[PDB]
Structures are given as structure tokens and as C-alpha cells.
Write an enzyme that holds these catalytic residues in place. Sequence first.
Site, mmCIF file in Angstrom:
data_model
loop_
_atom_site.group_PDB
_atom_site.id
_atom_site.type_symbol
_atom_site.label_atom_id
_atom_site.label_comp_id
_atom_site.label_asym_id
_atom_site.label_seq_id
_atom_site.Cartn_x
_atom_site.Cartn_y
_atom_site.Cartn_z
ATOM 1 C CE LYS A 1 18.977 10.122 60.257
ATOM 2 N NZ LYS A 1 18.041 8.222 60.242
ATOM 3 C CB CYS B 1 20.808 3.074 65.455
ATOM 4 S SG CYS B 1 22.259 3.375 66.929
HETATM 5 C C1 LIG Z 1 12.875 7.030 56.736
HETATM 6 C C2 LIG Z 1 12.951 6.362 58.793
HETATM 7 C C3 LIG Z 1 14.407 6.454 58.977
HETATM 8 C C4 LIG Z 1 14.706 6.518 59.943
HETATM 9 N N1 LIG Z 1 15.853 6.634 60.953
HETATM 10 C C5 LIG Z 1 15.462 6.678 62.061
HETATM 11 C C6 LIG Z 1 16.533 7.795 62.988
HETATM 12 O O1 LIG Z 1 17.430 8.599 62.791
HETATM 13 N N2 LIG Z 1 15.908 7.581 64.459
HETATM 14 C C7 LIG Z 1 15.466 7.215 65.433
HETATM 15 O O2 LIG Z 1 15.725 7.020 66.354
HETATM 16 N N3 LIG Z 1 14.801 6.475 64.300
HETATM 17 C C8 LIG Z 1 14.677 6.256 63.270
HETATM 18 N N4 LIG Z 1 13.553 5.258 63.049
HETATM 19 C C9 LIG Z 1 12.528 4.746 63.304
HETATM 20 C C10 LIG Z 1 11.363 5.782 63.267
HETATM 21 O O3 LIG Z 1 11.661 6.567 63.760
HETATM 22 C C11 LIG Z 1 10.010 5.576 64.086
HETATM 23 O O4 LIG Z 1 10.305 4.667 65.329
HETATM 24 C C12 LIG Z 1 9.322 4.604 63.367
HETATM 25 O O5 LIG Z 1 8.900 4.779 62.221
HETATM 26 C C13 LIG Z 1 8.664 3.434 64.307
HETATM 27 O O6 LIG Z 1 7.408 4.180 63.622
HETATM 28 P P1 LIG Z 1 6.338 4.781 62.505
HETATM 29 O O7 LIG Z 1 5.642 3.407 61.838
HETATM 30 O O8 LIG Z 1 4.997 5.333 62.482
HETATM 31 O O9 LIG Z 1 7.243 4.815 61.059
HETATM 32 C C14 LIG Z 1 13.073 5.860 61.140
HETATM 33 C C15 LIG Z 1 12.445 5.824 60.315
HETATM 34 C C16 LIG Z 1 12.070 5.987 59.181
HETATM 35 C C17 LIG Z 1 11.155 5.382 58.289
HETATM 36 O O1 LIG Z 2 19.109 5.618 59.541
HETATM 37 C C1 LIG Z 2 18.759 4.584 59.826
HETATM 38 O O2 LIG Z 2 18.754 3.221 58.800
HETATM 39 C C2 LIG Z 2 17.578 4.667 60.920
HETATM 40 C C3 LIG Z 2 17.957 4.734 62.304
HETATM 41 C C4 LIG Z 2 17.034 3.740 63.217
HETATM 42 O O3 LIG Z 2 17.004 4.515 64.168
HETATM 43 N N1 LIG Z 2 15.903 3.397 62.584
HETATM 44 C C5 LIG Z 2 15.740 3.273 61.319
HETATM 45 O O4 LIG Z 2 14.875 2.570 61.184
HETATM 46 N N2 LIG Z 2 16.544 3.892 60.522
#
Ligand SMILES: Cc1cc2nc3c(=O)[nH]c(=O)nc-3n(C[C@H](O)[C@H](O)[C@H](O)COP(=O)(O)O)c2cc1C
Ligand SMILES: O=C(O)c1cc(=O)[nH]c(=O)[nH]1
Lengths: 311, 311
Positions: free
Chosen positions: B43, B130
Site C-alpha cells: 500500500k 493519489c
Molecule cells: C481500493 C483501491 C485502493 C487504491 N489505492 C491505491 C494506492 O494506495 N496507491 C496506488 O498507486 N493506487 C491505488 N489504487 C489504484 C490501483 O493501484 C490501480 O491503479 C486502479 O485500481 C486501476 O486498476 P484496476 O482497473 O485493476 O482497478 C487503488 C485502487 C483501489 C480500487
Molecule cells: O487511497 C486512496 O484513496 C487511493 C490512492 C490512489 O493512488 N488511488 C486510488 O484509487 N485510491
Amino acid sequence: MLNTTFANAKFANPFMNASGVHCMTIEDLEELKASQAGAYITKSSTLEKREGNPLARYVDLELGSINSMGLPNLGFDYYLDYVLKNQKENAQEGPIFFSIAGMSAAENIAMLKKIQESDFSGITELNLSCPNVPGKPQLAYDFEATEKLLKEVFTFFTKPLGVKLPPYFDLVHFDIMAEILNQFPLTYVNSVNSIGNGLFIDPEAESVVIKPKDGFGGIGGAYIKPTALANVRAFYTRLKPEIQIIGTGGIETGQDAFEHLLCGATMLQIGTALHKEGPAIFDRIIKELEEIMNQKGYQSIADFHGKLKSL
Amino acid sequence: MLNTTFANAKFANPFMNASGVHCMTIEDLEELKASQAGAYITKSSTLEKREGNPLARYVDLELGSINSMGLPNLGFDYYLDYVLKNQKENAQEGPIFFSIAGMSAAENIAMLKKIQESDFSGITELNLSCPNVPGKPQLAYDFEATEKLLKEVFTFFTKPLGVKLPPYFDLVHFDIMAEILNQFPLTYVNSVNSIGNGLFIDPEAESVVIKPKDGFGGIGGAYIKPTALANVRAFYTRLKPEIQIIGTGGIETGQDAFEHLLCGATMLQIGTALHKEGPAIFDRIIKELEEIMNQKGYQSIADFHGKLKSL
Ligand SMILES: Cc1cc2nc3c(=O)[nH]c(=O)nc-3n(C[C@H](O)[C@H](O)[C@H](O)COP(=O)(O)O)c2cc1C
Ligand SMILES: O=C(O)c1cc(=O)[nH]c(=O)[nH]1
Ligand SMILES: Cc1cc2nc3c(=O)[nH]c(=O)nc-3n(C[C@H](O)[C@H](O)[C@H](O)COP(=O)(O)O)c2cc1C
Ligand SMILES: O=C(O)c1cc(=O)[nH]c(=O)[nH]1
């Protein structure tokens, strides 16, 4: 039940085609006039007639569409002559909407001067987001260039004018743009044009599916509803109430339409789903929306317009 | 068949979790280590532990997910102590990846100095996107501020560093960003973080479905695959070959992964689909990709990596 007032005019219902879809020829426009659409808008025009991009340039997807049409259109004078003649024989409870997308600032100013000088009494939509011309950052992602253009426009253009915007993805950009637009006597903002420059791949052929721009094109349809609703809602809470909203993006069912109106849209435009189904869509979706409203006890769009609830 | 080289390290297959999904506690991280993922990432952390936003903050959707987590995490020292202890007992054919997302430029420099000073020998991911902190334009949409931060970072940070970017939607923005990143000794770019500030509505309740930010959150999943593929492909034809690419966005099936690798991604990350399915996804999707490769006569990812054909 779907009676609507917008830009000081009355419409039978808020539904329209989105610019670019079913609106290239006079024959297409007469078909929209004959359909149950509340109002209709021409293809975005340029000063000269344009063939647009090489083919394949539009593709139907399971979850929406991808296109890089290249602004194919019959040219400003053709659309102007049509709307002017259709004003001359009085009928549509309804101004026609006229989209322009000049290849430069100069061309947009020149078209707006011709509109202003003509007898046109309908509504004009300035496309700031025309996305599949190769070699030009969407104008509405350049806030300083947008503001400069609008400043020049409102030194002369006194007729009803809306702008067609690309999707924004950052709340601070919504703040900046609403501050720019709020200084003008704009009639409306139309939110959203296509999500720009996405890509669809045929994995069997290992290739893109559209020809222009190495396969990159605007995305529409169900893929983009979440962003379109967000853009409508975010401008609804920020624009002065003088500027009303047209919501476009991912509208196929009455539920999708309900959702845009709940965010604060007053008229609604249908792109991808009208491409696929043809103008019979308007009768279907009006009935779906009325059925939703009947189940909730609603008799007018003012019963839930703009009243999306936060948690 | 899925052996991969990236950042000068060897991985059994290119799949990873996306930062934010299944990677908040030591226990989560040990489950990804136990699964068939080729690598995994923590994370995004901040210097202090954060509880993150009020509940409902994540929602599963038919076509993906919406989230406004608020960067809930156990704080930088907790992840650093974990990876440092897991380097000390040697095993993963595989550096761990470490994501950081400081609430300021200063906090990101402070965490990067601690990583540089520590014995960490894995890979760091600097989150420039973020998105669900209330009050801050995504840093990677501010090209000047991004360049100024990266200039300062590369005065001291010598270890392997990637940046997690938001989606871009204008080819000229791809040009500007590739010009900024190409001046640095970056290991990789990770394209795409969520589509920012989308909106999902429950039409029966007439309300949004997440609590923070009046219901606006990042969109993931099948909605965003056209945008994520475009962003991987557009950086793949612009970046210097020294900077490799991690594709993230809408990966659920072998075919989705195949498409990202065809565009140019070398490692792949799974966000929404892994949230829904848990770590057994890695075994399933590895097999799906292997079956596609077998049907095409492919024995390695190099047989098709980056070979997406234009028309
Ligand atoms: C629950 C949630 C938490 C997220 N938190 C972050 C995170 O802490 N840092 C990050 O760079 N991206 C975060 N993202 C973005 C994901 O890393 C990925 O970029 C975004 O979900 C696109 O991918 P997917 O279509 O497979 O969800 C998060 C996504 C989810 C759904
Ligand atoms: O922690 C979040 O809300 C989070 C961070 C991030 O970079 N991307 C996102 O979808 N959620
Ligand atoms: C085939 C095609 C042509 C388009 N041309 C234009 C156009 O000339 N002007 C305009 O402002 N938008 C145009 N768009 C964008 C649509 O007006 C609409 O904003 C986009 O398709 C989002 O709606 P949708 O999800 O219903 O398709 C076009 C869309 C389609 C698919
Ligand atoms: O004609 C084009 O390609 C076109 C114009 C526009 O504004 N939007 C889009 O999706 N296509």
C-alpha cells in the site's frame, strides 16, 4: 411529464442527439425532426466541407464505441442555409442547435460572426473538445487559451451560446473552469464529449480496430457514464444558475437519463446508443423515463432535477 | 512461459497486485507472497499512520469499482521494517515493490531519503496520482510541479524508482510528460492509477454510493481498460527504452493481460479484479494467458511484447 424549459425555450422532453451522431446531412436532420426527440443538434461544422479520416474510423464495442471520425461534415454554409430555411417555415416548438468546431480560433471566430450576422434565432454550441484532429491539444484543456477565446467571442456574440466540454478528472480543474465560464453570459455547458484517446484492441488479430491515429479514438457509451455524471454534477454545484447544463455520456436507458437529471442536467444528449439503434431510441427512452417517474410518484422533472443525495 | 525481466531482476511471471489492493497489512502481503503473483507491491504509505476516509469508501460495480479510500495505511516505518526484514531472510526471486504517497513534496522527499539511507534493495514506486485526498490537484497533472519534484529526487535517489501516473487523455500531454520523464534515470512508469473523480449513483435511492467527497471517487475495472491500454501504448512509443512500463487498468482475464503486453507493458498489476476475487486470481489469469499463448504458438512474452499492429 417531460416538459422542459432551457435557454428560455420550451421543449416537449429533454432528449436530443449528441453532435456527430445522426446529424450530418439534411436527410439525417429531418429524420431527427420527425422522431420524438425534444430537440436536435447539427454535426459540428468547419468553414470548408471535410471528408474526415480514413475508414475504419467508428467501431461499435460491447461497452460503448471508439471513434476518430476527423470531423467529416458538409461545411458551415450548408448547415447555416438549412437552419435558416427551417426557421423560415415555422415549426419545432424548439430552436435548432448548431454546433461549430473550427480548426483554429480564427475559424471559430469567423463562424460565430456569420451566425451573429445571420438571422439565425436558434442556439449555437461551440465545440472546445473536438478530439480526433491529429495535432492539437484539446482547447478546453488549455485554460488560458480557452479564456482568451471566450473573451473575444463575447465581445460580439449576443445570441444563445453553449460550449461542449471534454471530461475533467480533477476537482481543481472543475474549480478553474467554472471560474472562467462564470464570468460570461453563456447559455449552457454541455458535459461530456468523448473520453479522449483511448484504445481498443482485437487480441485475435493483435491489432487496433480503427485506422487513423494508430488506433487511438474517443470512447463513448457505458464505459464513460461515471465520468459524464461526475462532470455534470461537478459543474452543477459550481456554475452560476444562469448557465444551465446539457448532460451527455453513456445514456442508453431511462435510468441513465434519470441519473443525469438528478445530477443537474436540463437537456440530455444521446451519442453511441443513437448510432446503434437509430432515432426509434427516443420513443423507447422517453417511455422508460416516464415509467421510472410514475413508479416514484413524480409528474415533472422538477420533482427530482438536481436533487442527487450525498451520504 | 511467462518469465520476465524487469528493472534488471527476474520474475516468474509479470503479474502483481496493484498498490492499494490486498497489500495493507503484513498478513495481506504474506498472502500475496504465498500466491502465484510474480511480484507484489505495498500500500502507498505516508510518514504517519492514517485511518483514511469514512465508510462507505469502496464499492464493487458491475463494470468495475469506485473508491475514495483516503490512503488508509499503517505508516512508512511499518512497511519499511517489513520489507527490510524480508530481505534479511532471502527469498522471492523478486525484489518487493514499495509504494509511497506523501501528502506533500517534502514528505515524499523525506520518505525517499529514508529508503535511500536504509538497506532496502527492492524497487520504489512514487505515487504521483493519489486521487482521493480532498484538496490537491493530482501532482502528475501539474507538469511543472512534477518536473521540479523529480529533479530534486534524482539529486540523491540512486535506487530503482518508478512513478505511478494518472491517465492522460490528450496526445500532447503524452508528449510533454515523456519529455519530462526521459531526462531522468527512472526505472519505470506505471500507467494507470484510477480514472479520477467519477460518480456512481443508485437511482432507486437517488443518491451516491460512497461517503467521502459527495460520492466522487476513482474508477477502476472494465470501465477504464481503453484508457489504460492507450496510456501504456502511448508511453511505450515515446519513452526511452531505459524506462520500462507496468500496465495497470482493467485487467481481469488472460486476454486483458495479453492486450497490455501487446501494447508494451512488461509487468502487469491487478486492482479491482483482485479485490473481488482474492489472490487465487493469479493462478487463474496465468493459465488464461498461457492458453492464449499456446493457441498462437507463443513460448515467451517476447514473441508478442509491444507488437500491437496499426491498421
Ligand atoms: C481500493 C483501491 C485502493 C487504491 N489505492 C491505491 C494506492 O494506495 N496507491 C496506488 O498507486 N493506487 C491505488 N489504487 C489504484 C490501483 O493501484 C490501480 O491503479 C486502479 O485500481 C486501476 O486498476 P484496476 O482497473 O485493476 O482497478 C487503488 C485502487 C483501489 C480500487
Ligand atoms: O487511497 C486512496 O484513496 C487511493 C490512492 C490512489 O493512488 N488511488 C486510488 O484509487 N485510491
Ligand atoms: C460517431 C461520433 C461522432 C462524434 N462527433 C462529435 C461532433 O462532431 N461534435 C461533438 O461535439 N461531439 C461529437 N461526438 C461526441 C458525442 O457528441 C458525445 O459527446 C460522445 O459520444 C459521448 O456520448 P455517448 O456516450 O452517448 O456516445 C461524437 C461521437 C460519436 C460516436
Ligand atoms: O468528428 C470527430 O472525430 C469527433 C468530434 C468530437 O468533438 N468528438 C468525437 O468523439 N469525434
